[PDB]
Design a protein around this ligand. Structure first.
Ligand SMILES: [Cl-]
Lengths: 187, 96
């Protein structure tokens, strides 16, 4: 009429960190800005962090057998999900360099419960200039889709700082607070 | 007798040093009340929908041991799915 079940979902013991933005992965502007952040985490959280590449399409994670319509099989994706869970088992920070994920809606219906970090260039004109100083339309469209997300519910952390060092310190502070929450006293 | 509370409190103290077995994200809330008959009164873990819990071990069919993933939160008793469902059933019966 008018358009109005298990109580618990099992998720990794440490929520995996996934970076999205400023635009599409696979292209220089995004790949360089994300690489700087990964580089920073590796050394700021040395001994407490595992950063791992995920090439499989983990957007596909959740009587005809369900199969993927792309090159990334549901069986390969399931194996990668299991590997991510195992990485998190001992409560190290897990960061994923996940090739296929450019928008938080892509992980919304999975069991991964990521910490989504939005690496944001708040001005489109600034983004257009960065790109052209180094396919433009697909990149601008991607950044605009991110800019349309309801920010509070879509992202766990938004890094809109012009200065890399300030973005890095903001990310570090958030992850330090998560470390404390979980521990009671491009690549 | 409340020897039972003492044993429950001992199992809780022993779990402080055990590893996290698994984690869950909640799809419902639980707001603990005295009448839920928590193994050690005062030690239930309440939570809201979309909270994360770290679970260490099973206490019995009604209760797990673990903590809310939140700074300053400590180990206590988490309702099992069986217990959540029986509370939901009881409430829907009494509201009717
Ligand atoms: Cl009731």
């Amino acid at each position: 009429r008018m358009p109005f079940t298990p109580p618990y979902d099992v998720v990794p013991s440490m929520r995996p960190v996934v970076l999205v933005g400023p635009s599409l992965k696979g292209y220089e502007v995004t790949d360089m800005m994300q690489k700087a952040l990964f580089d920073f985490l590796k050394h700021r959280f040395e001994g407490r962090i595992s950063i791992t590449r995920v090439t499989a399409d983990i957007s596909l994670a959740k009587a005809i057998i369900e199969r993927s319509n792309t090159r990334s099989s549901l069986a390969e994706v399931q194996s990668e999900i299991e590997r991510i869970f195992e990485l998190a088992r001992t409560l190290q920070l897990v960061v994923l360099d996940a090739d296929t994920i450019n928008h938080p809606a892509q992980l919304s219906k999975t069991s991964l419960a990521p910490i989504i970090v939005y690496v944001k260039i708040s001005s489109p004109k600034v983004l257009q200039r960065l790109i052209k100083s180094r396919h433009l339309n697909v990149q601008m469209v991607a950044a605009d889709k991110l800019a349309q997300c309801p920010p509070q519910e879509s992202f766990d952390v938004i890094l809109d700082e012009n200065q890399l060092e300030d973005a890095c310190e903001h990310l570090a502070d958030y992850l330090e607070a998560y470390w404390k929450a979980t521990h009671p006293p491009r690549t | 007798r409340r020897e039972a509370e003492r044993q429950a409190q001992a199992q809780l103290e022993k779990a402080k040093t055990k590893p996290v077995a698994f984690a869950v994200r909640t799809n419902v809330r639980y707001s603990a009340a005295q009448e839920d008959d928590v193994p050690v009164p005062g030690m239930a873990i309440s939570f809201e929908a979309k909270d994360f819990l770290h679970v260490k071990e099973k206490f019995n069919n009604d209760w797990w041991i673990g903590r809310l993933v939140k700074e300053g939160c400590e180990i206590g008793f988490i309702p099992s799915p069986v217990k959540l469902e029986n509370m939901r059933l009881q409430h829907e019966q009494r509201a009717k």
